[PDB]
Amino acid sequence: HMIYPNILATIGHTPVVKINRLGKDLECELYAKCEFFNPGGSVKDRIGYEMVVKAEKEGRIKPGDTLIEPTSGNTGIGIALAGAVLGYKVIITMPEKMSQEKQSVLERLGAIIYRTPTEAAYNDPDSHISLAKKLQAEIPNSHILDQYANPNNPNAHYFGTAQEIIDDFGKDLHMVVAGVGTGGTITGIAKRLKEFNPAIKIIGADPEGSILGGGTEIKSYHVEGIGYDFFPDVLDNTLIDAYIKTNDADSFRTARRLIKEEGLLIGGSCGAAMWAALQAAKSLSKGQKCLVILPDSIRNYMSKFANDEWMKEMGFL
Amino acid sequence: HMIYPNILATIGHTPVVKINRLGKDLECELYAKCEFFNPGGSVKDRIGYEMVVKAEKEGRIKPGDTLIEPTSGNTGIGIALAGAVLGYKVIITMPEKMSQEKQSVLERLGAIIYRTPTEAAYNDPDSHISLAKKLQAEIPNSHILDQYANPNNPNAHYFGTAQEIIDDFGKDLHMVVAGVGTGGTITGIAKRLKEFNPAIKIIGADPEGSILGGGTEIKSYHVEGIGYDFFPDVLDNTLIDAYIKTNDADSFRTARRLIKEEGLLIGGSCGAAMWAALQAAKSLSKGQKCLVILPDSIRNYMSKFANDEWMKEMGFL
Numbered sequence A, B: 001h002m003i004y005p006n007i008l009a010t011i012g013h014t015p016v017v018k019i020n021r022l023g024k025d026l027e028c029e030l031y032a033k034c035e036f037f038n039p040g041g042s043v044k045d046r047i048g049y050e051m052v053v054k055a056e057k058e059g060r061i062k063p064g065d066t067l068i069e070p071t072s073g074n075t076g077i078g079i080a081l082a083g084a085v086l087g088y089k090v091i092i093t094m095p096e097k098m099s100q101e102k103q104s105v106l107e108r109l110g111a112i113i114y115r116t117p118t119e120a121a122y123n124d125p126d127s128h129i130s131l132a133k134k135l136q137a138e139i140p141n142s143h144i145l146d147q148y149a150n151p152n153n154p155n156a157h158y159f160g161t162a163q164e165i166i167d168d169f170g171k172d173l174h175m176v177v178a179g180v181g182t183g184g185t186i187t188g189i190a191k192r193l194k195e196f197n198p199a200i201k202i203i204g205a206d207p208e209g210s211i212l213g214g215g216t217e218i219k220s221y222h223v224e225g226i227g228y229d230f231f232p233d234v235l236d237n238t239l240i241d242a243y244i245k246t247n248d249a250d251s252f253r254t255a256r257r258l259i260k261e262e263g264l265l266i267g268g269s270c271g272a273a274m275w276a277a278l279q280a281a282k283s284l285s286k287g288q289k290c291l292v293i294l295p296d297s298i299r300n301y302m303s304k305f306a307n308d309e310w311m312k313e314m315g316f317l
């Protein structure tokens, strides 16, 4: 019976929904934590809020300053949302691979977007990571909050996301499956949940062509938000019990199944995480429960996996 | 805490957020009820659910049947969401004016879409309303729930939306502003809230070129979801204290202000309702409160008012 003082107060406390068709072949029950209910449309609202609010409280930033962030889109949106509400200028650097819908959301939130060449490595000089550094050196009173190293990324999940999981399931939860990009979600959740229940299994989903979950070959893929060519400082792989390597076709196919068979209007990496869970949860028995993190909404992919012509062009239909 | 058995259980109980910048010239305080948090992205999830569940309980429809609905998109999405979860085939008839994003969401939920000419009058043989009737006469086991006349449209707001408003505000609410399409939202809310507090003011927002809030001239406009060339049976204009006539330019400008200055990722008719509220709420004094219904998400308009190229093409930028 509470009124929210601003839109940032609606971040978090996201619904968990039972999966009723896709997990038909499992012994366990299967559930999804629906991060698309966040006001910016993704899990990254949590870390945009936490990084901005902690930095402001500590005196690292002040209203009127500029926040510069390299992003695949969602963290940019989370920071842009916090900046629109709290009074920060926001600049995003984003590879051309990321969807146009992300750029339009960013623009309407007041962020300025610099698009960079898709294929640049994390250290390549024209990359979004490098361009952000050049911008910070040239723009007075600017800051790169840096989701890849800022502890307020995993901390948002240790104190927030994982607390919600504890509140919803208690000890009656046996596995959590999460796609891994920065690693903040899986690391914050794994650390908190294993303190609470050391028997819980933590499963990462990592695309083929990423090194986070093993391997050395770097290769591009269409799924957005998961996988990297370097290990982010916030990722603690020692807390992860297993990785499942995912692929574009199965990710987008499973995402379409989530929409059509569960009515969940989700994104591409949601299909990746769910597909991984449909493999990994086979280790659970009757009466056990598996939770999958679903990071974002279909909105970011209307012109991509949600579009039949794009799917056929890219070999997924 | 709660685990939801399916996505339909997350419909409703939407946040009310204080408006902190746009209402700075008002004496009163200003608030927004954020219907874009519904799982289908709009207020119409409420009536898609209510119409399906009540018709099924009454024996008018049964799982496996086909539901055919004329819609501007959002009611179609709400019915498609219910149909995906509960097992109904869904066919939508929709004017060409409505966004491509709405059609893509409908298609991914498994619905079939028939597009009809924008300029057809509601009773022209080729309108979406007329086509739905022709399809129902031909397709076995098909039914039109009919949001324009079905009492479970306003009933969903009388028993649901309006109860939530009472729960959040009690007697400390003095005006509600809502755009009018079918009139189900404004009628169900007005009926319930005026029983609870007869002094509350109910303000409708109606586009220029619609007859709902007065006038006789029919003219096309780009804002989606509000205004019509006929009076829907569910609309009770005797419950509305005043209408404000809205226009595309002010609607899209105010929608862009809501996104940029409040971080509310809303749609075009949200700008219309908010622009109307910024006029009508001037009658309120310090210590009074005005609530604006915000019907849907920016997702439905990414290629339209949220896109600078579209705005330039249509003469708004």
Ligand SMILES: *Cc1c(COP(=O)(O)O)cnc(C)c1O
Pocket: B042, B044, B072, B074, B075, B179, B180, B181, B182, B183, B184, B185, B186, B224, B225, B226, B267, B269, B270, B295, B296
């Ligand atoms: C339908 C709708 C409205 C108006 O709601 P009604 O209950 O039909 O009067 C306003 N905006 C949008 C986007 C809608 O879909």
Ligand SMILES: N[C@@H](CCS)C(=O)O
Pocket: A213, A214, A215, A242, A243, A244, A245
């Ligand atoms: N994590 C993947 C690759 C192993 S290195 C797997 O379990 O097959």
